């Protein structure tokens, strides 16, 4: 079954701002998603020091960037801690509410959209370039889920029946028609070098 949920008002508001605000420096979405991946990898790595069996679902800690011109998608894959159903439905949104509030206030103060990560809500920057975001995720303590939202105030969660992931997260960006530059090898290389050069995990840029 597919379950549909309403974003809390503040999150819907932030998503609308991200979609509606004129802001040319869209490339920062990638550093935010890679940051999310890095944090998730740090988390499982740290947890594994006390419980080595947490890596039974996979020892390699890495990030893959996968462009697909046929589907017009850019996929950011990591073998981080992943997310439970409760993370997807409740926990992330609960934490994000205060980050969203603070971010929107800072914006009203003169901050700009590129500072979104300082508020812990960098994930939503995905909507700078994507009409729809699909998040496939697998945490050790739960099943594989697909979260999805085209904004408009609602998201869906379902159990995922695609290729099993072992552990980690895939963020699938269904790019906007005018944002296909982010499928180009040289463009992604440029952005990673500029914003994500010191990430402590191998980042592999797949080619088409």
Per CB under 6 A, 47 contacts ligand SNX? no
127 binds ligand SNX (CB under 6 A): no
Which listed residue (10, 27, 32, 78) binds ligand SNX by CB under 6 A?
78
Distance CA 141, CA 83 (A): 9
3-class SS at 137? strand
Alpha carbons 49 and 46: distance in angstroms, whole number: 6
**Is residue 96 within the footprint of ligand SNX (CB under 6 A)?**
yes
The verdict on 67 binding ligand SNX (CB under 6 A) reads no
Q: How far is the CB of 160 from ligand SNX (least distance, A)?
A: 13
CB of 35: closest distance to ligand SNX in angstroms?
9
Provide the annotated binding site. 36, 78, 97, 123
Binding residue (CB under 6 A) for ligand SNX from 127, 147, 182, 201: 147
Residue with nearest beta carbon to ligand SNX: 40
Contact 139, 103 (CB under 8 A): no
Of 8, 17, 39, 176, which one interacts with ligand SNX (CB under 6 A)?
39
Return d(Cα 98, Cα 157) in angstroms, integer: 23
Residue 142 in contact with residue 108, Cβ under 8 Å? no
- Specify whether the CB–CB gap between 80 and 37 falls below 8 A: yes
């Amino acid at each position: 079954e597919v379950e549909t949920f309403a974003f809390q008002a503040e999150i819907a508001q932030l998503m609308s701002l991200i979609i509606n605000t004129f802001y040319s420096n869209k490339e920062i979405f990638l550093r935010e998603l890679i940051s999310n991946s890095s944090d998730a990898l740090d988390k499982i790595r740290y947890e594994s020091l006390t419980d080595p069996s947490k890596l039974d679902s996979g020892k390699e800690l890495h990030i893959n960037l996968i462009p697909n011109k046929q589907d017009r998608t850019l996929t950011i894959v990591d073998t981080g801690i992943g997310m439970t159903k409760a993370d997807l439905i409740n926990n992330l949104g609960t934490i994000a509410k205060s980050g969203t509030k603070a971010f929107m206030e800072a914006l009203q103060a003169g901050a700009d959209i590129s500072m979104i990560g300082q508020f812990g809500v960098g994930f939503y920057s995905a909507y700078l370039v994507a009409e729809k975001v699909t998040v496939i995720t697998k945490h050790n303590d739960d099943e594989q889920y697909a979260w999805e939202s085209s904004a408009g105030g609602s998201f869906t969660v379902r159990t995922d029946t695609g290729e099993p992931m072992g552990r980690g997260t895939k963020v699938i960006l269904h790019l906007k028609e005018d944002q296909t530059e982010y499928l180009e090898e040289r463009r992604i290389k440029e952005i990673v070098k500029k914003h994500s050069q010191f990430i402590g995990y191998p980042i592999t840029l797949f080619v088409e």
